[PDB]
Coordinates of C-alpha atoms and ligand atoms in Angstrom, one line a residue:
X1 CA -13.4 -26.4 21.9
X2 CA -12.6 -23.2 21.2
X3 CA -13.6 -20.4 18.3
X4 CA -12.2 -17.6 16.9
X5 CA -13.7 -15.1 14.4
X6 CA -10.8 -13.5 12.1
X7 CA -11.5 -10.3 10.2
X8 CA -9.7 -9.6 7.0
X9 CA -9.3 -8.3 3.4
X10 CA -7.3 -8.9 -0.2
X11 CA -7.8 -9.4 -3.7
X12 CA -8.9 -12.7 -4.4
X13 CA -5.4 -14.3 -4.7
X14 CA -4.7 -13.4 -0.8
X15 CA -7.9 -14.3 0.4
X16 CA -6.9 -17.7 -1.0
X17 CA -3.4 -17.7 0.3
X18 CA -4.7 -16.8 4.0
X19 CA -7.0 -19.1 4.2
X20 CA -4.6 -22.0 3.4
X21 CA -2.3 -20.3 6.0
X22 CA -5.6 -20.5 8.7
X23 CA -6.0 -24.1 7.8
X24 CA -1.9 -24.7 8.7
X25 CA -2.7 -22.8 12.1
X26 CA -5.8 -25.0 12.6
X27 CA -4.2 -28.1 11.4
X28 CA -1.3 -27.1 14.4
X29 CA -3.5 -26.0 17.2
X30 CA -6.5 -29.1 16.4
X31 CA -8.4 -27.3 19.6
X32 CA -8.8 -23.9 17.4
X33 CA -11.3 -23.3 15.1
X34 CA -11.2 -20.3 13.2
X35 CA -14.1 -18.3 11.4
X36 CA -13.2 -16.2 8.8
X37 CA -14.8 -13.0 8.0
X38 CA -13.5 -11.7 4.4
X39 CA -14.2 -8.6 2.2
X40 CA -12.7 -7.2 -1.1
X41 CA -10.3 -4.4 -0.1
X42 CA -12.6 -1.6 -0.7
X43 CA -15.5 -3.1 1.3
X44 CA -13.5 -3.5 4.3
X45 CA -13.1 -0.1 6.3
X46 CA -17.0 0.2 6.6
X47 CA -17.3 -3.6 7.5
X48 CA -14.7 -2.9 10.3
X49 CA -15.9 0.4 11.0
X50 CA -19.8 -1.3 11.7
X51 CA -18.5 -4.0 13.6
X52 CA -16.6 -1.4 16.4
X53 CA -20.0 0.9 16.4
X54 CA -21.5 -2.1 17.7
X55 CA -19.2 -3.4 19.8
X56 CA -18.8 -7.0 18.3
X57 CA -15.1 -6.9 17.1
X58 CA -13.8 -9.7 15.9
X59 CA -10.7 -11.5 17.7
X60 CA -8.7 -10.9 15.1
X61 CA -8.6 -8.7 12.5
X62 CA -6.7 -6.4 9.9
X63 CA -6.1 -2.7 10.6
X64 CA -5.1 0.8 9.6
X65 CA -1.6 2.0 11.9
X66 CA -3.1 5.5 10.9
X67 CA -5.9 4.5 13.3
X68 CA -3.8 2.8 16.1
X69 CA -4.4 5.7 18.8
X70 CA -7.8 6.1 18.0
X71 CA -8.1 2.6 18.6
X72 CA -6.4 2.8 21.5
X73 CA -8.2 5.6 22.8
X74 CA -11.5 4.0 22.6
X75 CA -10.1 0.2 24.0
X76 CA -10.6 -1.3 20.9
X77 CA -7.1 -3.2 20.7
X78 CA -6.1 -5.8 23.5
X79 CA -2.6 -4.6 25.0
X80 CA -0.5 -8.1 23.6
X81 CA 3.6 -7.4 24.8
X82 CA 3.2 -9.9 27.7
X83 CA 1.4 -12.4 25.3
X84 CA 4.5 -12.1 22.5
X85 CA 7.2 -11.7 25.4
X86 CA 5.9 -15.2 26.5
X87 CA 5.2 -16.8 23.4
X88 CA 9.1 -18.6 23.0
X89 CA 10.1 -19.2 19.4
X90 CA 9.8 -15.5 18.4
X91 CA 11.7 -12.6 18.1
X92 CA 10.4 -9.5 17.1
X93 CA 14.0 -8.2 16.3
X94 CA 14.1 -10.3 13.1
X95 CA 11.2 -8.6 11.8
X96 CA 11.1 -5.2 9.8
X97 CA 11.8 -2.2 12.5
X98 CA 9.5 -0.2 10.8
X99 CA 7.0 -2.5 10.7
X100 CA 6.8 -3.8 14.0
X101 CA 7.0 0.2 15.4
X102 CA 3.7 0.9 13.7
X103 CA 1.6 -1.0 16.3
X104 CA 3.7 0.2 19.3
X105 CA 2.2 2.7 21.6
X106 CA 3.1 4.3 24.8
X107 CA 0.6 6.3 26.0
X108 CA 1.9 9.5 24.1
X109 CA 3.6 8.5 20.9
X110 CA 3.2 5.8 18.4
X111 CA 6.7 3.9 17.4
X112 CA 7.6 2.7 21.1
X113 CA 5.9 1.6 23.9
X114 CA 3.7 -1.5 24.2
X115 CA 2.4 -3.8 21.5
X116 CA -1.1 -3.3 20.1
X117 CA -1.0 -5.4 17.2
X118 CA 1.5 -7.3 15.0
X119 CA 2.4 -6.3 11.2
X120 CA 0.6 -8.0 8.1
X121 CA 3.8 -7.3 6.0
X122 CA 5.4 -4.1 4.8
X123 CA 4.6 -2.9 1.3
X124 CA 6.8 -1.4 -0.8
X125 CA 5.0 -0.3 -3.7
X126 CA 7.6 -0.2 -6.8
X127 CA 7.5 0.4 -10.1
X128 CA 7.4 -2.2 -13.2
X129 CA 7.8 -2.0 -16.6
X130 CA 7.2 -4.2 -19.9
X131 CA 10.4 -5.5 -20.9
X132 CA 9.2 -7.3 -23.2
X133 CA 7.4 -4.6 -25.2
X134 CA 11.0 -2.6 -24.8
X135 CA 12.4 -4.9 -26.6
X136 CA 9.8 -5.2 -29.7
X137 CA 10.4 -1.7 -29.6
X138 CA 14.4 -1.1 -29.7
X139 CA 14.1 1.3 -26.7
X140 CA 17.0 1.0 -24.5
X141 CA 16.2 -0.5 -21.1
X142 CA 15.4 1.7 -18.2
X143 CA 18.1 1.8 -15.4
X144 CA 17.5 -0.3 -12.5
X145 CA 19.4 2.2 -10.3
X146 CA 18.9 6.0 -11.7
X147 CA 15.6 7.2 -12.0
X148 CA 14.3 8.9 -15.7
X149 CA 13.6 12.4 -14.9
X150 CA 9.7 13.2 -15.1
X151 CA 11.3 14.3 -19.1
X152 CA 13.2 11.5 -19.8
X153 CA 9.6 9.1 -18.5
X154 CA 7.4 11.2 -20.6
X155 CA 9.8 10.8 -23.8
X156 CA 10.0 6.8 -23.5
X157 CA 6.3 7.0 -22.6
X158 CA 5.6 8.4 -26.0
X159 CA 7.8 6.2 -28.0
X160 CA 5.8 3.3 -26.6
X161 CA 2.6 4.6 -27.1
X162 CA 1.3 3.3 -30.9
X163 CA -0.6 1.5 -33.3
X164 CA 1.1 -2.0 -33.3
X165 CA -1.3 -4.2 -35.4
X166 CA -1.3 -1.2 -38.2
X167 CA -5.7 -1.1 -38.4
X168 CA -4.9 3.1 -37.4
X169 CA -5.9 2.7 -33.9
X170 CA -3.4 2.8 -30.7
X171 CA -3.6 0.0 -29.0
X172 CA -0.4 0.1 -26.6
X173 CA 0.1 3.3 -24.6
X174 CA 3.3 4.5 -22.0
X175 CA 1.2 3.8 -19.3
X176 CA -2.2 4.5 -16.8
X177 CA -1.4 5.2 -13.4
X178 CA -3.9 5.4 -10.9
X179 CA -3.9 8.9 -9.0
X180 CA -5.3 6.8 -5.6
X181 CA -2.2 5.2 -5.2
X182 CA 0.6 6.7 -7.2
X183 CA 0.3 10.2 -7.3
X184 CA 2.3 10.1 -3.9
X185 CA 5.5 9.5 -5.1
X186 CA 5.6 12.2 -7.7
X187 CA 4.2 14.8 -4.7
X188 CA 7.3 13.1 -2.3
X189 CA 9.6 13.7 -5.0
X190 CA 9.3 16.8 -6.5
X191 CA 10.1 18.0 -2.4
X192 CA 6.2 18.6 -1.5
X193 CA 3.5 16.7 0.6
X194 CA -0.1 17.1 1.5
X195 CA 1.0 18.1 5.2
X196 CA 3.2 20.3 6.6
X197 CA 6.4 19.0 8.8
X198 CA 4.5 19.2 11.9
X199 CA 1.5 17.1 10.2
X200 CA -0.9 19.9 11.4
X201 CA -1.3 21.9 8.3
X202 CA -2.5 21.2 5.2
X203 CA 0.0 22.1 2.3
X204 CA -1.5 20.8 -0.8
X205 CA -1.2 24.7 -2.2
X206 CA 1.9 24.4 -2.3
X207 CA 3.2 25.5 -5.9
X208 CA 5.5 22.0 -5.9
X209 CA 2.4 20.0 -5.3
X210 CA 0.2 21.6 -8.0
X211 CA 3.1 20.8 -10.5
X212 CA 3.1 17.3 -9.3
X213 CA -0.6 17.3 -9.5
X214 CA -0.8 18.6 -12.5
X215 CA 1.7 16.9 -14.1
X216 CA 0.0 13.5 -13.0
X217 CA -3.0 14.4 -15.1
X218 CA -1.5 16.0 -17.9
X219 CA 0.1 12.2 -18.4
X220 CA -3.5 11.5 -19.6
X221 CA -4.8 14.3 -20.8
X222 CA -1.6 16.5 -22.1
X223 CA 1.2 14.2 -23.3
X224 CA -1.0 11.3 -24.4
X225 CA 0.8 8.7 -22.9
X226 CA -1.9 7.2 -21.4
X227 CA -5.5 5.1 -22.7
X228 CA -7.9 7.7 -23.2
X229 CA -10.6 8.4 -20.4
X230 CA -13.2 6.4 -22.5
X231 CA -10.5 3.7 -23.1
X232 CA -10.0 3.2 -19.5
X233 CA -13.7 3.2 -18.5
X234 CA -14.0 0.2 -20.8
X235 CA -11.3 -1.6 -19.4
X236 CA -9.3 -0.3 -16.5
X237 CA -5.3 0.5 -16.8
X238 CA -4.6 -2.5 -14.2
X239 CA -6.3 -4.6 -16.3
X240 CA -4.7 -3.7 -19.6
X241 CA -0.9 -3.7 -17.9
X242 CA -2.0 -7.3 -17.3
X243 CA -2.9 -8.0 -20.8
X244 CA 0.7 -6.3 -22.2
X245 CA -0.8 -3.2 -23.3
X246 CA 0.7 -0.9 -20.8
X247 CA 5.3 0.1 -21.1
X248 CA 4.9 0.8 -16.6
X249 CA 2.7 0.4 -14.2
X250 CA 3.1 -0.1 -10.1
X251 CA 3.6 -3.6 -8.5
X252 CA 3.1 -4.4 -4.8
X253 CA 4.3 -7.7 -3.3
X254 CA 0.5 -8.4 -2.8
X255 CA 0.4 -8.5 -6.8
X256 CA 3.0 -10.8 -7.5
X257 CA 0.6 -14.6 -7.2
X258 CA -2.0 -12.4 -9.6
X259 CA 0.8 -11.4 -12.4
X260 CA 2.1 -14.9 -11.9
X261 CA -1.3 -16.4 -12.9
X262 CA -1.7 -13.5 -15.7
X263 CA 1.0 -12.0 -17.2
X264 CA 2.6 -13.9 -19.7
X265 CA 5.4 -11.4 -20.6
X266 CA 8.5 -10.9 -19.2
X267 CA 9.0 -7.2 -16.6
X268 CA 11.4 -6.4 -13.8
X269 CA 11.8 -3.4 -11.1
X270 CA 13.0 -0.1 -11.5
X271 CA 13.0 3.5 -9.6
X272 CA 9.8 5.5 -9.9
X273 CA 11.0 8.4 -12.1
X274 CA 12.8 11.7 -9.9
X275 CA 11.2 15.3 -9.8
X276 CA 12.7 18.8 -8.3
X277 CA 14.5 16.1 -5.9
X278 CA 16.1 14.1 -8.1
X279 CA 15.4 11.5 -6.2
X280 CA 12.9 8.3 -6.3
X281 CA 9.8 8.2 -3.9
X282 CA 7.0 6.0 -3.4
X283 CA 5.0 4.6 -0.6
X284 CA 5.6 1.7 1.7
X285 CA 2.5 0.4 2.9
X286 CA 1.4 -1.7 6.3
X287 CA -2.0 -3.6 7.8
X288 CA -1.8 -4.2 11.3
X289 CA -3.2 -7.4 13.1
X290 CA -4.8 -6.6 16.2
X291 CA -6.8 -8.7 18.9
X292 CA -9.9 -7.7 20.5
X293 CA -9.8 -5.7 23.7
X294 CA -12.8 -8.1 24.6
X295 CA -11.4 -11.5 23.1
X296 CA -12.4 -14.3 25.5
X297 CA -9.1 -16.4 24.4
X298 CA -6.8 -13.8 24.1
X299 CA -3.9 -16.5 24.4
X300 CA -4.7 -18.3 21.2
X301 CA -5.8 -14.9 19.4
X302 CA -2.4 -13.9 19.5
X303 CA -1.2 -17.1 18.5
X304 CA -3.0 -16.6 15.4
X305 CA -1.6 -13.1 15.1
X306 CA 1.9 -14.5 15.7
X307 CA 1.8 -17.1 13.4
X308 CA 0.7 -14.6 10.3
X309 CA 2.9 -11.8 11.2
X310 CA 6.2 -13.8 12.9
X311 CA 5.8 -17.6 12.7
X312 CA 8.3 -19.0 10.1
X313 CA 6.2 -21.5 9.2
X314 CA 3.4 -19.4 8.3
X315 CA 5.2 -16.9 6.6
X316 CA 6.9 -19.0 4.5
X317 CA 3.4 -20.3 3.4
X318 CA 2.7 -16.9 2.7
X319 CA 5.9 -15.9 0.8
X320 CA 5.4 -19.1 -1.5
X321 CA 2.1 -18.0 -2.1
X322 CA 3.5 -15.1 -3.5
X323 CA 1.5 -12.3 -1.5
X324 CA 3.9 -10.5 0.7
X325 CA 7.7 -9.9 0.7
X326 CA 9.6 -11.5 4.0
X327 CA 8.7 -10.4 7.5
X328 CA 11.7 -11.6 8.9
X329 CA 15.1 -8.8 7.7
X330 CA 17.4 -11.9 6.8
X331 CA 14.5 -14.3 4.9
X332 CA 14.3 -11.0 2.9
X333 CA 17.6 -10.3 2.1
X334 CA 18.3 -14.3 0.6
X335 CA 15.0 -13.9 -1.0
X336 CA 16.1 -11.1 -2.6
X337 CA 19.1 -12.6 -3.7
X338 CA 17.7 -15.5 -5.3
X339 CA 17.7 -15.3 -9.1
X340 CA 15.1 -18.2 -9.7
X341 CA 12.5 -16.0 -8.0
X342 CA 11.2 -13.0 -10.3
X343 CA 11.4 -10.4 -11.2
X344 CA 15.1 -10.4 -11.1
X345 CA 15.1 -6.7 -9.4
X346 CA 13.0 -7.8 -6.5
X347 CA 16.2 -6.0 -4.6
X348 CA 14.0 -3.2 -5.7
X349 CA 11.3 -3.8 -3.0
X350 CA 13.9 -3.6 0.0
X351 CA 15.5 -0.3 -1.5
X352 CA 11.8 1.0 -1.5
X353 CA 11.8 -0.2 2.4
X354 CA 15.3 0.7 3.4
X355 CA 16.0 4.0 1.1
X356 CA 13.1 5.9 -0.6
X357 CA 9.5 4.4 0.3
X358 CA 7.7 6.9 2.7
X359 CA 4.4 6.5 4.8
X360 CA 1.1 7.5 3.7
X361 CA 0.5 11.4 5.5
X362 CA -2.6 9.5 7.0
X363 CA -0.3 7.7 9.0
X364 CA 0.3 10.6 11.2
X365 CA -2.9 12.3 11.7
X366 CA -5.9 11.0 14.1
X367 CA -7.8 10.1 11.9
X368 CA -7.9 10.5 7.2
X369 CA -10.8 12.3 6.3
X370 CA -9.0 15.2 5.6
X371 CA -6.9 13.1 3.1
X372 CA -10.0 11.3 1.8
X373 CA -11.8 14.7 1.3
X374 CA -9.0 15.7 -1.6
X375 CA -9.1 12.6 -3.5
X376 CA -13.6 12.8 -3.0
X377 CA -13.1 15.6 -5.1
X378 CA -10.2 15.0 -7.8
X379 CA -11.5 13.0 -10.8
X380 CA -12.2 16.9 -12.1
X381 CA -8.8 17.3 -12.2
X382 CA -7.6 14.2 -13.7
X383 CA -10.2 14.0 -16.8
X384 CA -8.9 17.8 -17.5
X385 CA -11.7 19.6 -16.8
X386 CA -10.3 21.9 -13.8
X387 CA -6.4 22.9 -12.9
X388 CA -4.8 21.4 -10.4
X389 CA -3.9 25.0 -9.0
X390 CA -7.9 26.1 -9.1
X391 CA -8.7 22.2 -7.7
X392 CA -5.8 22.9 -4.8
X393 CA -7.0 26.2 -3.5
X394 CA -10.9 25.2 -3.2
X395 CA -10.0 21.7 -1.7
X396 CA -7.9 23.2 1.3
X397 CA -10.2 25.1 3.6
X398 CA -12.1 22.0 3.2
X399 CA -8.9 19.8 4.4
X400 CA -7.7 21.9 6.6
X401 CA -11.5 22.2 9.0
X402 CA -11.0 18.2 8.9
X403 CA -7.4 18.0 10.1
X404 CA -8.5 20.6 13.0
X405 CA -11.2 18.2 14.0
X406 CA -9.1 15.4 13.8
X407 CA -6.5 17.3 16.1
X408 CA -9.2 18.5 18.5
X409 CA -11.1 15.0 19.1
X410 CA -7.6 13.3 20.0
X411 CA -7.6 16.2 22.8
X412 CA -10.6 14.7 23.4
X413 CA -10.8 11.1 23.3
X414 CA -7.2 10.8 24.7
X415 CA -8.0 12.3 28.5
Ligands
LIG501 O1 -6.2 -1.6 -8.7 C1 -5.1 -2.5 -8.9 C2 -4.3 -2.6 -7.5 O2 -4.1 -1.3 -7.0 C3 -2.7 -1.2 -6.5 O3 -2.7 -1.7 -5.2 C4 -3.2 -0.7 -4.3 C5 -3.8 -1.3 -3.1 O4 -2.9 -2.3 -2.5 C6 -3.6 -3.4 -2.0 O5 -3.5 -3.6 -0.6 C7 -2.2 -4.1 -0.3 C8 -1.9 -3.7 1.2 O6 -1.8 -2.3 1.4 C9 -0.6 -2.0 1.9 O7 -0.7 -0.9 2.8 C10 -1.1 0.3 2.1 C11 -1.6 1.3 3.1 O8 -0.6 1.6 4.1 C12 -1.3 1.9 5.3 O9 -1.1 3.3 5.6 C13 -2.8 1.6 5.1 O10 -3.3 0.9 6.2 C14 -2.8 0.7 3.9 O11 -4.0 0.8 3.2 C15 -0.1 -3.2 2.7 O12 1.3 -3.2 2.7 C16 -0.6 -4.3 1.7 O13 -0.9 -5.5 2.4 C17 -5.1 -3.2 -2.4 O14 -5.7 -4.4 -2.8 C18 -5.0 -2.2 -3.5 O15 -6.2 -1.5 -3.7 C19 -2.0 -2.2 -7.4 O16 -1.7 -1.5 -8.6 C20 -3.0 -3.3 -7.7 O17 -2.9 -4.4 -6.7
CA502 CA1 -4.0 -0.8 -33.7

């Protein structure tokens, strides 16, 4: 008798894994129907974006905490506490702190306050490496608790970058890491950031963040260690990890069912290698599910919600289909634990969570533009054909007008 519309993203081995959760919810609530609305990852901020212009949001859907306020701010997220509060058979204390704190808002600051949506998952995003290529080669193991200075990572990166087959051609490099998504941790750990501490000024000048920055790119360009720039326009570096041609690259608990279905060699968990700090950083990343302000079954719209984010039931539909780590602290920690689940350091996820991961900078700002306005510009850098220190300096003015904006329209919107 009744519909809902549910708004989401993933790769194509989470769209598959959600939907089979969906059918569980519908298959327990026989009077909800559910229509789903899906996109590939990259699609999905402009699909979302289009659909609050017009004021048709979907009952459900995915969404950025970085936007949380803004959303607030313009009523586009239903106020649920009194809807989970009532809803016996959860208890939001079991679930990741930090997770559930993204979506909590009190009028002034995000982190307490009422709930205005319910976490997808946190995500830890670790590092992997090859162990089975390691091996062929003789090199000694990585540590799975001491991270390789940025040294130390380019000197194993170059013993396992060769020509295996013997034709003269490489064809098995250190590694290819994607500047959207891991230059963070090399930032975080060499003591820099893209903001300062009070998340109002921009800070990407900072001589710490052009070493990190250029140290990033001279993994391509410089040291070698990486498939050349025509290499990976044939076939990208995620791709070639997948086929075993790659000693590291990055795995999220959202990759997992995909390596499962492709990799055929063996790999484990390690620290991301240490700058200036010495010690490890990466990112630990968060959706939020949210219900429409203007829901007409805001009762059952939460119990979607619920059962994604909190319901044991659906989360361990989710866990087995290998998309996401544990909600719920304790499911976590045995999961963890379990050596018949790989890789065997999947402990390395919940350090990531509990030790070293940090948020992305967007997180704390009104809105990203000024964030997505230094990565517009950056594949300059990265192919070699500009400094980071020249790249830095024009980018920041730039940056800096955006995060000004973004300060001066929460003034705004918020009164
Ligand atoms: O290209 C290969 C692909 O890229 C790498 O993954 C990066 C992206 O992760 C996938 O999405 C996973 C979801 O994102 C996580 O939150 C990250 C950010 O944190 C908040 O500030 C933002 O709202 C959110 O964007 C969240 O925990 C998780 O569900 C996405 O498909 C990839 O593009 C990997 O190397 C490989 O999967
Ligand atoms: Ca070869």
């Amino acid at each position: 008798k009744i519909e809902l519309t549910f708004m989401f993203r993933g790769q194509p081995q989470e769209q598959t894994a959600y939907k089979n959760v969906v059918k569980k919810f519908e298959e327990k609530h026989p009077n909800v129907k559910v229509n789903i609305v899906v996109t590939s990852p990259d699609q999905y901020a402009t699909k979302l974006r289009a659909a609050i212009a017009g004021r048709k949001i979907p009952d459900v859907f995915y969404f950025n905490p970085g936007e949380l306020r803004a959303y607030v701010n313009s009523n586009v997220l239903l106020d649920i506490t009194k809807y989970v509060e009532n809803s016996k058979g959860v208890n939001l204390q079991d679930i990741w702190e930090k997770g559930v704190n993204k979506y909590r808002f009190d009028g002034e600051k995000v982190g307490q306050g009422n709930l205005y949506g319910l976490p997808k998952d946190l995500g830890p995003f670790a590092l992997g490496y090859n162990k089975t290529m390691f091996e062929k080669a003789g090199i000694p193991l990585p540590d799975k608790d001491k991270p390789y200075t940025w040294q130390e990572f380019i000197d194993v990166c170059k013993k396992l970058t060769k020509d295996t087959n013997g034709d003269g051609k490489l064809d098995q490099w250190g590694t290819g890491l994607n500047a959207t998504w891991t230059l963070q941790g090399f930032v975080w750990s060499n003591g820099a950031d893209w903001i300062d501490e009070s998340k109002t000024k921009v800070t990407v000048d900072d001589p710490k963040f052009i070493e990190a920055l250029q140290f990033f790119a001279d993994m391509q360009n410089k040291y070698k260690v990486t498939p050349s720039i025509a290499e990976a326009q044939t076939l990208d570096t995620y791709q070639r990890w997948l086929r075993g041609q790659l000693g590291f690259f990055p795995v999220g608990p959202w990759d997992l069912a995909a390596f499962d279905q492709q990799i055929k060699f063996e790999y484990d968990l390690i620290p991301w290698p240490a700058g200036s700090t010495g010690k490890p950083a990466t990112w630990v990343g968060s959706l939020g599910i949210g219900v429409s302000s203007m829901t007409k079954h805001p009762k059952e719209a939460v119990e979607l919600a619920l059962y994604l984010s909190a319901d044991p039931e659906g989360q361990k539909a989710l866990v087995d289909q290998r998309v996401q780590l544990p909600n719920s602290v304790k499911v976590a920690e045995e999961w963890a634990k379990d050596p018949s689940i790989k890789p065997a350091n999947k402990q390395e996820f919940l350090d990531i969570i509990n030790d070293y991961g940090h948020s992305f900078p967007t997180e704390y700002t009104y809105n990203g533009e000024w964030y997505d306005e230094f990565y517009r510009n950056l594949q300059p850098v990265l192919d070699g054909k500009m400094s980071a220190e020249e790249y830095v300096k024009k980018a920041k003015p730039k940056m800096q007008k955006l995060l000004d904006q973004a300060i001066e329209q929460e003034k705004q919107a918020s009164k």
